[PDB]
């Protein structure tokens, strides 16, 4: 099963942890809207302010 | 301002004049939902696809779409012993009476 | 300020960078919910008992409990043809994508 | 079936119409929360401001 919600619990270091968690759970999420939405949110939060 | 969560809501039937037909119980904890609905949506239960899409759109362009709102997503029933219109004492299990979890929709 | 009703919400997948994996459709009308939640609750479908109780309590003492919120109560699915992680073209019926009715909860 | 929602569509004359509709549909509503809630709301709206 897709474990995208497990990454939202612990949540620029937090953004990297979120990204690593999404990478780890990217296998079972073949086509889930929450996964792509979380990826887009991580990207938007990394671009915002100043992160790298 | 905190995220969408569950707060207290002590319903008292005497405060509504419903004790004339309700025998028991006379008060109970029903809870309610309140809190911010921001990105990402953190919840034990998976949000609806529409809620995800609308929250993402509000995160993108907040001027366009309004955010989702904190509302109950799971509820449990309670039993009520009352007197119906026919002067009969009825034990009825009313559904959707107690909020067990809140979410953004 | 009008009561809880359904408004437009044109979702465009190109605006979210999702066109890289979504083949069709690229945009659709998802609608959303907005409006006042006052007494009484006027809706084609019956509101939950908890919504009735909370709206009545807000009508009684608004200082105590916050009002109910306008959220979707019926939704319909849409079909999406996309490319999953295994380079396969999948036709999937995503549920809870289009709001068909709004209500106060 | 309880027809309490049918009275909320047309809605101090409107309050009297609401009351008459609730009286007309009071048979099938043996024990429905919406019926008692609508009655309480009619009473609260009649007491409010100035109605009789």
Residue numbers in the entry:
A (entry chain B), D (entry chain B): 36 to 46, 80 to 120
B (entry chain A), C (entry chain A): 397 to 501
Copy text verbatim from the article accompanying this structure deposition:
Repulsive guidance molecules (RGMs) are cell surface proteins that control processes ranging from brain development to iron metabolism. RGMs can bind to the cell guidance receptor Neogenin (NEO1) and act as coreceptors for the bone morphogenetic proteins (BMPs). Structural analysis of RGMs and their complexes with NEO1 and BMP2 revealed a common RGM architecture comprising an N-terminal domain (RGMND) essential for BMP binding and a C-terminal domain (RGMCD) sufficient for NEO1 binding. Here, we determined high-resolution structures of all three human RGMs in complex with the BMP ligand growth differentiation factor 5 (GDF5) and the ternary complex of GDF5 with RGM and NEO1.
We also determined the structures of the RGMAND–GDF5 and RGMCND–GDF5 complexes. However, while the GDF5 structure in the three complexes is largely invariant, the relative orientation of the three RGMND helix bundles towards GDF5 differs. The relative position of the α3 helix differs by ∼5 Å in RGMBND–GDF5 and RGMCND–GDF5 complexes, with its N terminus being the anchor point for a rotation of RGMND. The pivot point seems to be RGMB Leu103 (RGMA Leu97, RGMC Leu101). A relative rotation around this leucine permits the side-chain of the preceding arginine (Arg100 in RGMB) to be inserted between GDF5 fingers 1 and 2 in the RGMA– and RGMB–GDF5 complexes. In the RGMCND–GDF5 complex, however, this arginine side-chain is placed above finger 2, potentially explaining the different arrangements of the RGM α3 helix. Strikingly, the superposition of GDF5-bound RGMBND and RGMCND requires translation by 5.6 Å and rotation by 15.4°. Intriguingly, mutations in the α2–α3 linker of RGMC (Gly99Val, Gly99Arg, Leu101Pro) cause iron overload and impair interactions with the closely related BMP2 (17). GDF5 interacted similarly with RGMCND (Kd 3.9 μM) and weaker with RGMAND (Kd 16.7 μM). The juvenile hemochromatosis-causing mutation, Gly99Arg, in RGMCND and a corresponding mutation, Gly101Arg, in RGMBND attenuated the interactions with GDF5, Kd > 20 μM and > 150 μM, respectively.
